[PDB]
Design an enzyme around this catalytic site. Structure first.
Site, PDB file in Angstrom:
ATOM      1  N   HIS A  41       0.797  -1.216   0.000  1.00  0.00           N
ATOM      2  CA  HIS A  41       0.000   0.000   0.000  1.00  0.00           C
ATOM      3  C   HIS A  41       0.833   1.271   0.000  1.00  0.00           C
ATOM      4  O   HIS A  41       2.046   1.268   0.255  1.00  0.00           O
ATOM      5  CB  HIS A  41      -0.962   0.003   1.176  1.00  0.00           C
ATOM      6  CG  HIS A  41      -0.341   0.352   2.490  1.00  0.00           C
ATOM      7  ND1 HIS A  41      -1.003   1.084   3.448  1.00  0.00           N
ATOM      8  CD2 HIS A  41       0.860   0.036   3.025  1.00  0.00           C
ATOM      9  CE1 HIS A  41      -0.229   1.222   4.507  1.00  0.00           C
ATOM     10  NE2 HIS A  41       0.915   0.608   4.268  1.00  0.00           N
ATOM     11  N   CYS A  95       4.422   5.639   5.726  1.00  0.00           N
ATOM     12  CA  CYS A  95       4.524   4.427   6.496  1.00  0.00           C
ATOM     13  C   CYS A  95       5.901   3.824   6.239  1.00  0.00           C
ATOM     14  O   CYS A  95       6.463   3.964   5.149  1.00  0.00           O
ATOM     15  CB  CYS A  95       3.398   3.443   6.146  1.00  0.00           C
ATOM     16  SG  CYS A  95       3.135   2.122   7.246  1.00  0.00           S
ATOM     17  N   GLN A 113      -6.785  -3.268   9.882  1.00  0.00           N
ATOM     18  CA  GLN A 113      -7.971  -2.412  10.052  1.00  0.00           C
ATOM     19  C   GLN A 113      -9.054  -2.847   9.081  1.00  0.00           C
ATOM     20  O   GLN A 113      -8.765  -3.157   7.928  1.00  0.00           O
ATOM     21  CB  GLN A 113      -7.597  -0.960   9.822  1.00  0.00           C
ATOM     22  CG  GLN A 113      -6.607  -0.433  10.877  1.00  0.00           C
ATOM     23  CD  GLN A 113      -5.901   0.848  10.462  1.00  0.00           C
ATOM     24  OE1 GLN A 113      -5.885   1.831  11.210  1.00  0.00           O
ATOM     25  NE2 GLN A 113      -5.317   0.843   9.268  1.00  0.00           N
ATOM     26  N   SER A 136      -5.814   5.467  10.045  1.00  0.00           N
ATOM     27  CA  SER A 136      -4.421   5.820   9.761  1.00  0.00           C
ATOM     28  C   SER A 136      -4.310   6.942   8.754  1.00  0.00           C
ATOM     29  O   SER A 136      -3.366   7.721   8.789  1.00  0.00           O
ATOM     30  CB  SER A 136      -3.643   4.610   9.202  1.00  0.00           C
ATOM     31  OG  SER A 136      -3.576   3.583  10.158  1.00  0.00           O
ATOM     32  N   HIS A 139      -5.478   5.220   1.877  1.00  0.00           N
ATOM     33  CA  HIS A 139      -4.622   4.190   1.290  1.00  0.00           C
ATOM     34  C   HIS A 139      -4.933   3.929  -0.184  1.00  0.00           C
ATOM     35  O   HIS A 139      -6.085   4.009  -0.597  1.00  0.00           O
ATOM     36  CB  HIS A 139      -4.794   2.851   2.016  1.00  0.00           C
ATOM     37  CG  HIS A 139      -4.669   2.908   3.510  1.00  0.00           C
ATOM     38  ND1 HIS A 139      -3.567   2.419   4.171  1.00  0.00           N
ATOM     39  CD2 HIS A 139      -5.528   3.325   4.473  1.00  0.00           C
ATOM     40  CE1 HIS A 139      -3.734   2.553   5.474  1.00  0.00           C
ATOM     41  NE2 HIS A 139      -4.915   3.103   5.686  1.00  0.00           N
TER      42      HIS A 139
END
EC number: 5.2.1.8
Length: 145
Positions: A41, A95, A113, A136, A139
Protein backbone atom coordinates in the site's frame (compact mmCIF):
# COMPACT_ATOMS: atom_id res chain seq x y z
CA UNK A 1 -22.89 -8.61 -11.45
CA UNK A 2 -20.65 -10.05 -8.68
CA UNK A 3 -21.10 -8.87 -5.05
CA UNK A 4 -19.41 -5.52 -4.38
CA UNK A 5 -19.91 -4.24 -7.96
CA UNK A 6 -22.50 -1.92 -9.44
CA UNK A 7 -23.13 -0.52 -12.89
CA UNK A 8 -22.83 3.24 -13.23
CA UNK A 9 -22.84 5.91 -15.91
CA UNK A 10 -19.97 8.30 -16.56
CA UNK A 11 -20.98 11.83 -15.61
CA UNK A 12 -18.78 13.28 -18.38
CA UNK A 13 -19.31 10.80 -21.28
CA UNK A 14 -22.43 8.85 -20.36
CA UNK A 15 -20.62 5.55 -20.94
CA UNK A 16 -21.37 2.60 -18.68
CA UNK A 17 -18.68 1.74 -16.13
CA UNK A 18 -18.43 -0.41 -13.03
CA UNK A 19 -17.74 0.64 -9.47
CA UNK A 20 -16.84 -1.46 -6.43
CA UNK A 21 -17.98 0.05 -3.12
CA UNK A 22 -15.74 -2.25 -1.09
CA UNK A 23 -12.47 -1.45 -2.88
CA UNK A 24 -13.50 1.92 -4.41
CA UNK A 25 -12.11 0.65 -7.72
CA UNK A 26 -13.75 1.80 -10.94
CA UNK A 27 -13.26 0.41 -14.43
CA UNK A 28 -14.87 0.47 -17.91
CA UNK A 29 -14.95 -3.31 -18.39
CA UNK A 30 -17.59 -5.61 -16.87
CA UNK A 31 -15.80 -7.45 -14.03
CA UNK A 32 -15.84 -11.28 -14.24
CA UNK A 33 -12.72 -15.84 -1.19
CA UNK A 34 -8.97 -16.50 -0.54
CA UNK A 35 -7.77 -17.53 2.97
CA UNK A 36 -4.78 -15.19 2.79
CA UNK A 37 -3.71 -12.30 0.59
CA UNK A 38 -0.59 -10.25 0.14
CA UNK A 39 -0.81 -6.53 -0.44
CA UNK A 40 1.30 -3.45 -0.80
CA UNK A 41 0.00 0.00 0.00
CA UNK A 42 0.69 3.70 -0.25
CA UNK A 43 -0.57 5.67 2.74
CA UNK A 44 -1.14 9.40 2.81
CA UNK A 45 -1.68 10.68 6.33
CA UNK A 46 -3.48 13.86 7.37
CA UNK A 47 -4.01 15.95 10.49
CA UNK A 48 -6.77 13.67 11.78
CA UNK A 49 -4.71 10.48 11.32
CA UNK A 50 -4.38 8.42 14.52
CA UNK A 51 -0.68 9.30 14.50
CA UNK A 52 -0.15 12.44 12.37
CA UNK A 53 3.53 11.66 11.89
CA UNK A 54 5.72 9.58 9.56
CA UNK A 55 9.28 9.01 8.34
CA UNK A 56 8.53 11.69 5.71
CA UNK A 57 7.36 14.36 8.07
CA UNK A 58 7.50 14.67 11.83
CA UNK A 59 4.34 16.80 12.06
CA UNK A 60 1.73 15.94 9.39
CA UNK A 61 -0.47 19.01 8.93
CA UNK A 62 -2.26 18.42 5.60
CA UNK A 63 -6.05 18.28 5.70
CA UNK A 64 -7.89 15.08 4.90
CA UNK A 65 -9.13 16.83 1.73
CA UNK A 66 -5.53 17.60 0.69
CA UNK A 67 -4.55 14.00 1.45
CA UNK A 68 -7.33 12.73 -0.83
CA UNK A 69 -6.15 15.05 -3.67
CA UNK A 70 -2.65 13.54 -3.35
CA UNK A 71 -4.03 10.01 -3.40
CA UNK A 72 -6.17 10.76 -6.45
CA UNK A 73 -3.11 12.19 -8.22
CA UNK A 74 -1.00 9.11 -7.45
CA UNK A 75 -3.82 6.86 -8.71
CA UNK A 76 -3.92 8.85 -11.96
CA UNK A 77 -0.20 8.47 -12.51
CA UNK A 78 -0.24 4.79 -11.68
CA UNK A 79 -3.14 4.11 -14.03
CA UNK A 80 -1.55 6.13 -16.86
CA UNK A 81 1.67 4.15 -16.50
CA UNK A 82 3.60 7.39 -15.97
CA UNK A 83 4.67 6.00 -12.61
CA UNK A 84 4.71 2.57 -11.01
CA UNK A 85 2.88 1.91 -7.79
CA UNK A 86 6.14 0.72 -6.23
CA UNK A 87 7.99 3.89 -7.12
CA UNK A 88 5.32 6.16 -5.62
CA UNK A 89 4.96 4.01 -2.51
CA UNK A 90 8.72 4.10 -1.92
CA UNK A 91 8.80 7.88 -2.29
CA UNK A 92 5.56 9.09 -0.75
CA UNK A 93 3.94 6.51 1.53
CA UNK A 94 3.60 7.85 5.11
CA UNK A 95 4.52 4.43 6.50
CA UNK A 96 7.83 2.59 7.09
CA UNK A 97 6.71 -0.05 4.57
CA UNK A 98 7.65 2.54 1.94
CA UNK A 99 11.16 1.01 2.31
CA UNK A 100 9.76 -2.27 0.96
CA UNK A 101 7.95 -0.63 -1.99
CA UNK A 102 4.83 -0.57 0.19
CA UNK A 103 4.76 -4.34 0.77
CA UNK A 104 2.99 -5.49 3.93
CA UNK A 105 3.46 -9.21 3.37
CA UNK A 106 0.72 -11.83 3.61
CA UNK A 107 -2.14 -11.77 6.09
CA UNK A 108 -5.51 -13.33 6.90
CA UNK A 109 -8.76 -11.76 8.02
CA UNK A 110 -8.61 -10.56 11.60
CA UNK A 111 -5.29 -8.69 11.43
CA UNK A 112 -5.62 -5.39 9.56
CA UNK A 113 -7.97 -2.41 10.05
CA UNK A 114 -11.34 -3.55 8.75
CA UNK A 115 -11.75 -1.21 5.75
CA UNK A 116 -8.27 -2.15 4.63
CA UNK A 117 -8.98 -5.85 5.15
CA UNK A 118 -12.29 -5.74 3.27
CA UNK A 119 -10.71 -3.93 0.32
CA UNK A 120 -7.74 -6.34 0.31
CA UNK A 121 -9.85 -9.50 0.23
CA UNK A 122 -12.20 -8.10 -2.42
CA UNK A 123 -9.41 -7.23 -4.86
CA UNK A 124 -8.39 -9.69 -7.56
CA UNK A 125 -4.72 -10.62 -7.86
CA UNK A 126 -2.89 -7.69 -9.38
CA UNK A 127 -5.82 -5.32 -8.85
CA UNK A 128 -5.50 -1.90 -7.24
CA UNK A 129 -8.02 -0.20 -4.99
CA UNK A 130 -9.36 3.29 -5.15
CA UNK A 131 -8.93 5.48 -2.10
CA UNK A 132 -9.52 3.44 1.08
CA UNK A 133 -10.06 5.25 4.37
CA UNK A 134 -8.91 4.08 7.81
CA UNK A 135 -8.01 5.73 11.10
CA UNK A 136 -4.42 5.82 9.76
CA UNK A 137 -5.23 7.93 6.73
CA UNK A 138 -6.03 7.22 3.10
CA UNK A 139 -4.62 4.19 1.29
CA UNK A 140 -4.04 2.90 -2.22
CA UNK A 141 -3.93 -0.91 -1.95
CA UNK A 142 -2.34 -3.30 -4.44
CA UNK A 143 -3.07 -6.99 -4.08
CA UNK A 144 0.01 -8.87 -5.19
CA UNK A 145 -0.97 -12.43 -4.18
Amino acid sequence: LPPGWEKAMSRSSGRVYYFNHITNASQWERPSEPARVRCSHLLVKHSQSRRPSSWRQEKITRTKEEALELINGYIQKIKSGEEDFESLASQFSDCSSAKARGDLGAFSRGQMQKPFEDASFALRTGEMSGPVFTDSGIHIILRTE
